Structure 1
């Protein structure tokens, strides 16, 4: 249903500005002409027909995800050789972008929240037989309320990649969670220093990576990191399992986040 064809998205949406620039395009901000809703948009000019035919399934999936911690899709359109996709506006921005804005990493209370919610959001997906395949700071979004919104942004280096997936199975995401934590914890992920080539290999021969300044953080955090960053996919735990861990089982309030977001709304 949700993918319209032979309607110009400019008839339903105005573009009021840009947000940055990635790799399969720029990020646009957009205002629903008739209903007022703000959106973030993504345009994709396609070479092939299958290329497109494939993204159309991606999207109809996102359509069946009604969760409080996953972005909602607000409309999608093929028109004049291009394909636009309109996601819920999250005015706290992406997490990575905050760290870069504040020039710093997250505190533990703040990581705790983000993790808590990513876990709840993952559990949902895996329970719908769905993999995300692409967890990172950059796909974790923010409301002012201080809730996350998990975002796909497409389905180019991959530090958050799992071991079993190299050089070349829900459990892959969980690994990528673990890295993202470290990412938020240190702005940059492990092996940032390296060449995209050598990362892959580095992730393979390397022991599970740990935190850079270990006595800066709790037992609960690392004990959580350690058990999530299992290189065997089999002995690596599920979403729900991790949700029972103390690091996140205690977490009821997003204040820590929320205040972070508010800070960034002032530095801007």
Structure 2
């Protein structure tokens, strides 16, 4: 019969990752597996290792397609794939360690939302990340505060996949009832999440969230007077229920809320603060 290649440039087989990487801690433990912190035995370089016991060869294949997609995302605000291993029934995904951790974990630690200037840098950097992915025909499909990882320098790295610190709060109304516009809606939801710690409809019975997205007007900030006219306008247009009229990432990058954002300082200070509290 016609057959598929199992040779991929970014997946190495029959090599024990544990000969190359030392596990020095745990960063997360999701439904798909643990994420470890790892240190390279030869160089001391740091990585996140996401480790999955893949059941089916179909599953393995789906994941590897995603790894190979990530391998082509060379952008300064997207996590950097080192590479992957498949060993002993375990798929290891190695990413360049972002030591600041995830924005929502930072919010929960400090028990507060981001200032608007912090939200401005994250929004700006996310849109650049998105504009890049969409132009390579990549839909992210997984945007939320839990996917925004932080470096010490104060830049984001957008994670292809992440876990909140799974009710689908960020789902686009078109998907509720595959196109780049759905990522824009989820960005909008993510910004409210960063403004208010929790995304809209956090209080509801999770069984009602999708219903509520479908029937409701788009969500708005809870205390509008706390936020600039720019920010409220950005949300208004990003959170358009009609994907046709919803603006692209390219169009959003020219919105006054982010068009002038050139410095990461606001965010750099947030990571510094969260570093002292731990």
Whether the TM-score (by the shorter chain) exceeds 0.5 is yes
Q: 1:210 aligns to what SS in structure 2?
A: coil
Shift, 1:54, TM fit:
1.3
Shift, 1:47, TM fit:
1.5
Aligned-partner Cα distance in 1 for 2:17–2:126: 31
Aligned-partner Cα distance in 2 for 1:203–1:236: 16
Residue equivalent to 1:211: 221
Asked if the contact 1:167–1:200 (Cα under 8 Å) also holds between the matched residues in 2, the reply is no
Aligned-partner Cα distance in 2 for 1:27–1:46: 15
TM-superposition CA deviations, 1:174-221 (whole Å, max 9, x none): 000000000000000000111222101110001000000110000000
Instruction: Tell me the TM-score normalized by structure 2.
Output: 0.94
Aligned-partner Cα distance in 1 for 2:206–2:12: 37
TM-superposition CA deviations, 1:88-127 (whole Å, max 9, x none): 1001110000001111000000000000000000000000
Asked if the contact 2:34–2:52 (Cα under 8 Å) also holds between the matched residues in 1, the reply is no
Shift, 1:21, TM fit:
2.2
Aligned-partner Cα distance in 2 for 1:56–1:26: 17
Asked if the contact 1:167–1:201 (Cα under 8 Å) also holds between the matched residues in 2, the reply is no
Shift, 1:154, TM fit:
6.6
Q: 2:32 aligns to what SS in structure 1?
A: coil
Residue equivalent to 1:37: 45
Change (3 A) 1:209 1:100: same
Aligned-partner Cα distance in 2 for 1:72–1:35: 17
Asked if the contact 1:141–1:151 (Cα under 8 Å) also holds between the matched residues in 2, the reply is yes
Q: 1:23 aligns to what SS in structure 2?
A: coil
Aligned-partner Cα distance in 1 for 2:73–2:86: 21
Change (3 A) 1:168 1:123: closer
Runs of 4+ aligned structure 1 residues displaced above 4 Å come to none
Aligned-partner Cα distance in 2 for 1:168–1:126: 12
Q: How many residue pairs are counted as aligned between the two chains?
A: 268
Aligned-partner Cα distance in 2 for 1:195–1:225: 25
Instruction: Tell me the TM-score normalized by structure 1.
Output: 0.97
Asked if the contact 1:31–1:37 (Cα under 8 Å) also holds between the matched residues in 2, the reply is yes
Asked if the contact 2:70–2:160 (Cα under 8 Å) also holds between the matched residues in 1, the reply is no
Change (3 A) 1:139 1:23: same
Q: 2:176 aligns to what SS in structure 1?
A: coil
Aligned-partner Cα distance in 2 for 1:176–1:10: 37
TM-superposition CA deviations, 1:45-87 (whole Å, max 9, x none): 1111111011111101100111100010112011111111111
Asked if the contact 1:243–1:249 (Cα under 8 Å) also holds between the matched residues in 2, the reply is yes
Shift, 1:35, TM fit:
2.5
TM-superposition CA deviations, 1:209-245 (whole Å, max 9, x none): 0000110000000000000000000000000100000
Matched, 1:148 2:148: no
Q: 2:130 aligns to what SS in structure 1?
A: helix
Please point out which of 79, 84, 91 is paired with 2:92.
84
Change (3 A) 1:263 1:152: same
Residue equivalent to 1:110: 118
Q: Please report the RMSD computed on the Cα atoms of aligned residues, expressed in angstroms.
A: 1.3
Aligned-partner Cα distance in 1 for 2:94–2:51: 9
Asked if the contact 2:146–2:162 (Cα under 8 Å) also holds between the matched residues in 1, the reply is no
Shift, 1:168, TM fit:
11
Aligned-partner Cα distance in 2 for 1:82–1:260: 36
